[PDB]
Curated annotation (Swiss-Prot):
ATP binds at residues 36, 120-127. The lineage of its organism: Eukaryota, Metazoa, Chordata, Craniata, Vertebrata. This is Kinesin-like protein KIF2C. It is found in: Cytoplasm, Cytoskeleton; Nucleus; Chromosome, Centromere; Chromosome, Centromere, Kinetochore. Interacts with CENPH. Interacts with MTUS2/TIP150; the interaction is direct. Interacts with MAPRE1; the interaction is direct, regulated by phosphorylation and is probably required for targeting to growing microtubule plus ends. Interacts with KIF18B at microtubule tips; this interaction increases the affinity of both partners for microtubule plus ends and is required for robust microtubule depolymerization. Phosphorylation by AURKA or AURKB strongly reduces KIF18B-binding. The chain holds residues 229 to 587 of 725 of the full protein. Residues 30-324 form the Kinesin motor domain. In complex with KIF18B, constitutes the major microtubule plus-end depolymerizing activity in mitotic cells. Regulates the turnover of microtubules at the kinetochore and functions in chromosome segregation during mitosis. Plays a role in chromosome congression and is required for the lateral to end-on conversion of the chromosome-microtubule attachment. A motif (Nuclear localization signal) lies at residues 176-179. It comes from the Eukaryota.
Amino acid sequence: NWEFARMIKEFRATLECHPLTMTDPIEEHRICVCVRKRPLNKQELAKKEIDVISIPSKCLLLVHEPKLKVDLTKYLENQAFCFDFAFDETASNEVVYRFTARPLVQTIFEGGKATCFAYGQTGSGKTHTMGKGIYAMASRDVFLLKNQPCYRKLGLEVYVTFFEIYNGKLFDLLNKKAKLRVLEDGKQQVQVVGLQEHLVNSADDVIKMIDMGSACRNSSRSHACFQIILRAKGRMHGKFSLVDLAGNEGAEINKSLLALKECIRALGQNKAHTPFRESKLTQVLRDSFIGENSRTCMIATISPGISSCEYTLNTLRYADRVKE
Ligand SMILES: Nc1ncnc2c1ncn2[C@@H]1O[C@H](COP(=O)(O)OP(=O)(O)O)[C@@H](O)[C@H]1O
Ligand SMILES: [Mg+2]
């Protein structure tokens, strides 16, 4: 694809770039939508994959889409997408976390609900981002916040869960992949019956849990959900749910992802009710899509190679419609 690479180089040599750094200020969003470009791996560089993604600013991602005219003239359809944050291949997990999940950790101490989702094709970087990862960094900061004088008063304990969702069925990853069941009552309250919450006193305990759990969980065909639950005297104070979604590149997965978008869209419009029932994922998280102090972030992970271009565009089109 020598000519497409040449055109991409000419575009990049003229593009003056000012991407995100950590001295950009943390932003407080109800709905935060971001994109994360991973680097080409050694195998992609070996197969001579072209990088078709540029990030000229904090908010802007460009796709250099290779196109053919009817007369077989090669050109680039350079497509732009605008997000709350765009993270390039130099952004570490710590930098991503700062602008996404980290500002939502306080939310659960104010008695709110927080969610964080990684979304994109298999091989994009969802598990790398969540599972070092955002689960561990959130857990760390939860234990720093609850040792502070303000919140050390409240008598808070920290509990955790870790489950996967495959083909509309929930499996407990901390209790031997037991097939739990999700039930809803007349007041639209949802409970995952048989899901045990595990008490934890340190972030090191949680990392042992995530490692225990990850060993259990193709994991590209399932959702994995790790929850941090704050309880005040056994009474729930706050909850953070963090989800490594199934790869979006079949019919169960697609309806699940579509369901999630609609629930996030409803949260965005501060609606009293959302269409939570349309997948198991959204049913289990129903509580996180409603309320005054409910907040969410989604990280759309992308593979930058020319051969993934159509999957990249699908991911970006979806992420584009998550926040209005
Ligand atoms: N930002 C990144 N920097 C370096 N390597 C990455 C990055 N994102 C993903 N990878 C690596 O690429 C491979 C695929 O990532 P993974 O997290 O398993 O993808 P997914 O969960 O979306 O299928 C892994 O070996 C992973 O560690
Ligand atoms: Mg994965």
